[PDB]
Amino acid sequence: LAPNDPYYQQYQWHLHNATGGINAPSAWDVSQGEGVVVAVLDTGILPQHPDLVGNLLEGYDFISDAETSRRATNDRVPGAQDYGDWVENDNECYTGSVAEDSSWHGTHVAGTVAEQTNNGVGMAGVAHKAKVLPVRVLGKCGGYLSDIADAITWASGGTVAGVPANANPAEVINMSLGGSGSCDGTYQDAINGAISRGTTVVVAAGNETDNASKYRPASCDGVVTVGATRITGGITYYSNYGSRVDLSGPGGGGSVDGNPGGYVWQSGSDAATTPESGSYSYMGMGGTSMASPHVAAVAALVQSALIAKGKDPLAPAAMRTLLKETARPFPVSIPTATPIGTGIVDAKAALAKALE
Ligand SMILES: *C(=O)[C@H](Cc1ccccc1)NC(=O)[C@H](CC(C)C)NC(=O)[C@@H](NC(=O)N[C@@H](Cc1ccccc1)C(=O)O)[C@@H]1CCN=C(N)N1
Ligand SMILES: [Ca+2]
């Protein structure tokens, strides 16, 4: 499928480039992810972006701190509107932090997952007939472990005190987020709960040019940990590495690969602070955060294709194995001290093996 989205051909190398893309054109001849729900646990969403509307579920906002969520109370509430995660001043988030503009990070990630495609508008998405379940866990200066843990529980169909039952449990959770430290205790348990309910959990490896074993959820047991590659097919300058990394997706090399080749391109906004301060746009961003949803969406394509043929969904372990086994080997040597998994997720190869 060669979709008609106006910026697809020039900007979206991560979809269709021969050394650094995920083989999406060929994959889309087989599956577009119809029938699956992917939970995007992130900064929230711009729910009326014209290139996403139609693919979104209402979702929920798990941030329990008014100052972080920018909402009127410390309550968690239905809907996942991103209020904007801008930080006005240096050092507000930690000693040494730098002021910056709103990210609209969750809208970009949701775009990779399910941006409306072949619609004559903007860009394309990977599992573009799936639905995104946006679950807002990150706000000003980030978010809180216990909000992130409960979000995993709910998104995967478990029960959380104080939140109504999830009518749309997700086959796949994407967490383009993390912090330093040991998985485990609260985090590992929430994750184990999602796995026991059949949900595949896909996370970013992190961006510290460091061992993924030192960050969470990158180092948790039972997740698919995703490193980041360049348009070239080689490691990005920032990608974490190490034996916990299972495979990689396109994250964008940054300035060394220029514009657009250094960046992943999707739905977002140019707003500096609040949604109203700007307007719907398409943004280029780089990180393991952009690689992770390519893999999450391939998982969605696979579940969808299985259900369409009347076959059983893969359990989480089988899904991770399939994604690793079918990854395309890197077209550029990876240094043995910085391994980033078996290869770059290959949407078509994963489909072909799952349907054999
Ligand atoms: C996209 O490339 C990155 C992926 C990533 C993976 C691993 C480690 C860090 C980052 N995604 C992001 O940076 C998220 C979106 C944008 C930057 C706007 N933001 C965060 O990940 C966010 N993390 C955060 O708030 N962590 C706190 C809660 C927590 C505790 C334990 C485990 C997981 C999360 C924390 O206390 O660590 C952001 C970046 C990393 N650090 C902070 N504080 N904020
Ligand atoms: Ca589009």
Author numbering: 1 to 356
What does the paper say about this structure?
Through the COVID-19 pandemic it gained more prominence by being a key pathogen in respiratory co-infections. This study will present a structural analysis of StmPr1, S. maltophilia’s main virulence factor, an excreted serine protease. StmPr1 is a member of the subtilases family defined by Siezen & Leunissen et al.. It shows the main structural and functional elements of the family, such as a reactive triad consisting of Asp42, His105, and Ser28922. The catalytic triad consisting of Asp42, His105, and Ser289 is located on top of β1 (Asp42), α4 (His105), and α10 (Ser289).
